[PDB]
């Protein structure tokens, strides 16, 4: 989830349905709010974030997070000669090293798999379709 930090002040004390305060971290990412697109300081809080910090307590590492400029996670694209450019999106940042590690909801597939190592799945899910339910079925006469 993305909300900007209120002024300079950082993150809301907002609480989960089970009484716990919601954890949060700062992330620099694309903003469409301004007409031009600046890489904007933002507050982001998530399942993947709680997981990341869980690791961070478990793991020796420290973390700084910024959202990828492209809204897309990644896909191979661009120029014809040799193999040219690289898949646009956060994955591309990973190979480029813009981010050394990618934490997001990323499905795991072989085409990507040859290029990079993949962590064991935190989640197991498959594709599906969303369609509105409501087609009904009102007087004692009926």
């Amino acid at each position: 989830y993305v909300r900007p930090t209120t002024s300079d002040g950082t993150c809301r004390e907002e609480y989960t349905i089970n009484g716990d305060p919601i954890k949060k971290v700062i992330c620099n990412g694309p903003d469409e709010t301004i007409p031009g697109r600046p890489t904007v300081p933002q507050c982001c809080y998530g399942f993947c974030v709680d997981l990341l910090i869980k690791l961070a307590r478990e793991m020796d590492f420290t973390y700084e997070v910024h959202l990828v400029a492209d809204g897309k996670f990644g896909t191979q694209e661009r120029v014809n000669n040799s193999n040219a450019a690289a898949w646009n999106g956060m994955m591309g940042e990973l190979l480029s090293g813009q981010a050394d590690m990618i934490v997001a909801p990323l499905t795991i597939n072989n085409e990507r798999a040859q290029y990079i190592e993949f962590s064991k799945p935190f989640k197991y899910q498959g594709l599906t379709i969303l369609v509105k339910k409501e087609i009904p079925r009102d007087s004692f006469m009926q």
Binding site: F122, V131, F140
Partner: protein, 180 residues
């Protein structure tokens, strides 16, 4: 939508849209796979740029159907319940944290991920972030609802009672008058 293979998909229609995001990994499934390669193009038409817009189209009813992986979708399914998920998860897959093959930290990460699975840490995290509050399988369980529905009968009976008041007034005037 009967299945991952839906004759309704198989019988595409300009009239009945089925929508996705171009450059979404689903699109990679469509392009890479030869067997369904014909079916890809119908999906390619009328693509949306981002997740919010894609959910909105169905909500706005601009697009009759939306296709995406469950983990993002089911939470939304709970979030509205105006919208529903259908069929069986196909392209069954998992979500994982990316690292370069050269980096050994991933070796710990998976090792850690598993350790997080065994204790039920994930189960409680999905339990927190998947609300599950309001929704159900729509077809057969109207019975929880129906207060309004009965009201639609009962109000009529009651209107009968209001008639009871008019009739009573008439009887009261007419009777005392009758024997006056």
């Amino acid at each position: 939508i009967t299945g991952i293979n839906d004759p309704r998909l198989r019988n595409p229609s300009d009239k009945f849209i089925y929508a996705t995001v171009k450059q979404s990994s689903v699109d990679i499934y469509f392009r890479r796979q030869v067997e369904l390669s014909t079916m890809y193009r119908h999906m390619e038409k009328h693509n949306y740029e981002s997740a919010a817009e894609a959910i909105q189209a169905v909500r706005d009813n601009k697009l009759h159907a939306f296709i995406w992986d469950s983990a993002v979708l089911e939470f939304e399914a709970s979030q509205k319940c105006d919208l529903v998920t259908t069929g069986e998860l196909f392209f069954r897959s998992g979500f994982g944290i990316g690292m370069r093959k050269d980096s050994p930290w991933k070796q710990e990460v998976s090792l850690n991920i598993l350790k997080s699975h065994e204790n039920g840490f994930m189960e409680e995290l999905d339990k927190t972030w998947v609300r599950y509050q309001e929704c159900d399988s729509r077809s057969n369980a109207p019975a929880t609802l129906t207060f309004e529905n009965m009201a639609g009968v009962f109000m009529l009976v009651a209107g009968g009672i209001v008639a009871g008041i008019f009739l009573i007034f008439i009887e009261i005037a007419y009777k005392s008058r009758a024997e006056a």
